[PDB]
Swiss-Prot record, chain A:
Further comment found in the protein's record: PubMed:9418870 was unable to show an association between TAF2 and TFIID.
Whole sequence portion shown: 801 to 987 of 1199
Subunit structure: Component of the TFIID basal transcription factor complex, composed of TATA-box-binding protein TBP, and a number of TBP-associated factors (TAFs), including TAF1, TAF2, TAF3, TAF4, TAF5, TAF6, TAF7, TAF8, TAF9, TAF10, TAF11, TAF12 and TAF13. Interacts with TAF2C1. Component of the TFTC-HAT complex.
Family indicated by similarity: Belongs to the TAF2 family.
Organism listed in the record: Homo sapiens (Human)
Protein name: Transcription initiation factor TFIID subunit 2
Gene name in the database record: TAF2
Protein's job: The TFIID basal transcription factor complex plays a major role in the initiation of RNA polymerase II (Pol II)-dependent transcription. TFIID recognizes and binds promoters with or without a TATA box via its subunit TBP, a TATA-box-binding protein, and promotes assembly of the pre-initiation complex (PIC). The TFIID complex consists of TBP and TBP-associated factors (TAFs), including TAF1, TAF2, TAF3, TAF4, TAF5, TAF6, TAF7, TAF8, TAF9, TAF10, TAF11, TAF12 and TAF13. TAF2 forms a promoter DNA binding subcomplex of TFIID, together with TAF7 and TAF1.
UniProtKB/Swiss-Prot annotation, chain B:
Domain notes: Ectopic expression of the histone fold domain acts as a dominant-negative mutant resulting in differentiation inhibition.
Misc. remarks from the entry: 'Taube nuss' means 'empty nut' in German.
Whole-protein coverage range: 156 to 207 of 310
Disease: Neurodevelopmental disorder with severe motor impairment, absent language, cerebral hypomyelination, and brain atrophy: An autosomal recessive disorder with onset soon after birth or in early infancy. Affected individuals do not show developmental progress, are unable to sit or walk, do not acquire speech, have poor visual fixation, and show poor overall growth associated with feeding problems. Additional variable features include seizures, spasticity, and joint contractures. Brain imaging shows hypomyelination, thin corpus callosum, and cerebral and cerebellar atrophy.
Triggers of expression: Induced with triglyceride accumulation.
Family from the record: Belongs to the TAF8 family.
UniProt protein name: Transcription initiation factor TFIID subunit 8
Gene symbol of the encoding locus: TAF8
Protein purpose: The TFIID basal transcription factor complex plays a major role in the initiation of RNA polymerase II (Pol II)-dependent transcription. TFIID recognizes and binds promoters with or without a TATA box via its subunit TBP, a TATA-box-binding protein, and promotes assembly of the pre-initiation complex (PIC). The TFIID complex consists of TBP and TBP-associated factors (TAFs), including TAF1, TAF2, TAF3, TAF4, TAF5, TAF6, TAF7, TAF8, TAF9, TAF10, TAF11, TAF12 and TAF13. The TFIID complex structure can be divided into 3 modules TFIID-A, TFIID-B, and TFIID-C.
Length: 187, 52
């Protein structure tokens, strides 16, 4: 519900950057979510489910420009030695980050971890909700997939994906969404 | 009675129901934020803004 206290229109000009210690009720929401994150770091009650809802809340706060659009928290919760559900919500978050914000580098990181991690189900869900929530959306190509990203994606369809069927099935879904029935306007 | 007789003092009723549970819950919130501040400045810390 606090995450559904979506307040998009506080920063009229530039108020993103510790300026007001941005204000006023947003800060109270920040106090509560900070509390629950450290409580579930200490208590933890059942799957860090609270931590999951918190992470969704913090992203929705980035989607209103109050805590700035920086992935490094979520990045530090997409790490290896956490729970699945934490990690899975962080990946949903950073996927929408790379959707609206145009971070090329973390997309590259994401694909490298699609290649490289031991857990299957994160690869499954990365590719699933990456395809449900895409960046680089077909025939809207401002962030320039044509450069070398089509190349590495074609590679990951071919290479590195004989582990499981469904990973390259998801890569098929990637090329369905991103530039489906055609040349990708490279050559 | 002001010199001869005496009485007894209990002196602490304090039974205001909603006020009581306000006291208890506010104190719980205090201990929450206290331990949060403690392990906040104690352990590995990453922020929301830069340098909070």
């Amino acid at each position: 519900a606090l995450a559904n206290s979506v307040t998009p229109a506080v920063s009229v000009n530039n108020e993103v950057r510790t300026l007001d210690n941005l204000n006023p009720d947003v800060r109270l929401i920040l106090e509560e979510i900070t509390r629950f994150l450290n409580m579930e770091k200490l208590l933890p009650s059942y799957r860090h489910t609270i931590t999951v809802s918190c992470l969704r809340a913090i992203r929705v706060l980035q989607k209103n420009g109050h805590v700035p659009s920086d992935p490094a928290l979520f990045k530090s919760y997409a790490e290896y030695g956490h729970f699945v559900d934490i990690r899975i919500a962080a990946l949903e978050a950073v996927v929408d980050y790379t959707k609206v914000d145009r971070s090329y580098e973390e997309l590259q990181w994401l694909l490298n971890m699609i290649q490289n991690d031991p857990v299957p189900y994160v690869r499954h869900k990365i590719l699933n909700m990456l395809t449900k929530n895409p960046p680089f959306t077909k025939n809207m190509e401002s962030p320039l997939c044509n450069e070398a990203l089509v190349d590495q994606l074609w590679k990951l369809m071919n290479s590195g994906t004989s582990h499981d069927w469904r990973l390259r099935c998801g890569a098929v879904d990637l090329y369905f969404t991103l530039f489906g029935l055609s040349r990708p306007s490279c050559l | 009675x002001x010199x001869x007789x005496x009485x007894x003092x209990x002196x602490x009723x304090x039974x205001x129901y909603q006020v009581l549970r306000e006291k208890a819950a506010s104190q719980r919130r205090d201990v929450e934020r206290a331990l949060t501040r403690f392990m906040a400045k104690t352990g590995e810390t990453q922020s929301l803004f830069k340098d909070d």
